[PDB]
């Protein structure tokens, strides 16, 4: 059947430490071995290491031993991965993955199944507020027959802020753009088309809401 | 330590045809290679293990080929939910090594720019600076360039993009460039400008405003 569950995403602060989960399901969990593997943001893949549940013990990338440490619990089925000394160039997501049957040292390993993967958040950081601004069309440009227009989102500490445009209603011709973290501050910003002559009569106004500082801004253009 | 390359980061494919993507080693891996497909964004799968078996209900339109230092992945007629990265694997040595990724993109009619620039705004002014934004919407393809242009000659080193991945929906990239000024350094200098280089134009789009016409 072979399924893995791992744990749920966490922010945590530098040099702390943290321990996720991969409950298997579906195989007999000590006959496979499991792997962690990292991906940061914009680079490939990278093994972390293994470690087989059926007796025989494991192996590991050297350059993240120390810093790691994989463990089992035979009995609930779940692997487990401890970093240590979190620094940010540990946020990454984070998968197990199982390695077919048979071995390891050569092949016989290769990942035939993956779990959804944990993200790992490293920050010192507290939670900031988000400072909405009202992009509004500029003085001399010459009257389209379609307006965009936007609000930029500044500030934000952590990560997740949603914007609304009408509150929900212009669902098209709406871009969400990646938000882009400078100095511990996240920003983001976000556009919406309306034909011209729907605006500035009919009213635009965006929503913000970022849920950790327990804000709920709205700007009108 | 085996160096896995992918020479290629991204890869333009319209939907039916042919594509290949290439694997390299930096050294002979006894066919011990693997293909892992990871959707946008989401979870990983193994397509093809030892060159070119083929993991089970991965569909025919895969094929894997290779020797000794170099490999290769076929999809055959490019269908849409192939539009993902693809990673190669050794399994030879130890540690079991990746290449940095390969992503398809879909080919599709050339589609121009819409871009538009705002001025900076009355609170954030009171908040003590002042950030100008362009935002260029919905181009393709994604080769796209971008200047700020101030009072004839131009200005980075305060600008800050953001690009979004193909849109799902219409096969697009839209992309917010923000300078971020001080409000003196925004006192000085009445034009502003955004400027924008693509394919679909041997002029420059240009978008400006006058700070002294606001």
Redesign the interface.
């Known amino acids: 059947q072979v399924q893995l569950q791992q744990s749920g995403a966490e922010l945590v602060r530098a040099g702390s430490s943290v321990k996720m989960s991969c409950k298997a399901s579906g195989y007999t969990f000590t006959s496979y071995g499991v792997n962690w593997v990292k991906q940061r943001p914009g680079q490939g893949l990278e093994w972390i290491g293994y470690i087989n549940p059926g007796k025989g013990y494991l192996s590991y990338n050297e350059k993240f031993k120390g810093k790691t440490t994989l463990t089992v619990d035979r009995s609930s089925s779940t692997a487990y991965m401890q970093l240590r000394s979190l620094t940010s160039e540990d946020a990454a997501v984070y998968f197990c993955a199982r390695s077919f049957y048979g071995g390891s040292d050569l092949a016989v390993y290769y990942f035939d199944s993956w779990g959804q993967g944990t993200t790992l958040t490293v920050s010192s950081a507290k939670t900031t507020p988000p400072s909405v601004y009202p992009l509004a069309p500029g003085c001399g440009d010459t009257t389209g027959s379609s307006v965009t227009l936007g609000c930029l989102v500044k500030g934000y500490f952590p990560e997740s802020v949603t914007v609304t445009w009408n509150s929900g209603s212009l669902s098209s011709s709406v871009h969400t753009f990646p938000a882009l973290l400078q100095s511990a501050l996240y920003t983001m910003s976000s556009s919406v088309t309306v034909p011209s002559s729907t605006w500035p009569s009919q009213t635009v106004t965006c929503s913000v809401a970022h849920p950790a500082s327990s804000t709920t801004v709205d700007k009108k253009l | 330590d085996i160096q ?1 390359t ?1 020479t290629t980061s991204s890869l333009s494919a319209s939907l039916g045809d042919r594509v290949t993507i290439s694997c390299r080693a930096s050294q002979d891996i006894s066919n ?1 290679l ?1 293909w ?1 497909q990871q959707k946008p964004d ?5 397509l093809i ?2 060159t070119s078996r083929l ?1 089970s209900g991965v569909p025919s339109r895969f094929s894997g080929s290779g020797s000794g230092t170099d490999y290769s992945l076929t999809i055959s007629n490019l269908e849409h939910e192939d539009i993902a990265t693809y ?1 190669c ?1 050794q ?2 040595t ?8 390969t992503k398809l993109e879909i080919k599709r009619a050339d589609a121009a720019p ?1 871009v ?4 900076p ?1 009355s ?2 002014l009171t ?1 003590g600076g002042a ?1 100008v ?1 362009c ?1 260029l ?1 919905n181009f393709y393809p994604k080769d796209i360039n971008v200047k700020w242009k101030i009072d004839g000659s131009e200005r980075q080193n305060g600008v ?5 991945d193909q849109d799902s929906k219409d096969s697009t990239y ?3 460039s ?1 300078l971020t000024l001080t409000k003196d350094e925004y006192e000085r200098h009445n034009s502003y400008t955004c400027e924008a280089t693509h394919k679909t134009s041997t002029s420059p789009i240009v ?4 700070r002294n ?2």
């Open positions: 896995m992918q011990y693997n892992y989401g979870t990983v799968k193994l293990y030892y993991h990673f694997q399994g030879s130890l540690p079991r090594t990746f290449g940095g990724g819409t538009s620039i705002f001025p705004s609170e954030q908040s950030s934004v935002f919407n800050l993009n953001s690009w979004t839209s992309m917010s923000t978008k400006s405003f006058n016409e606001c």
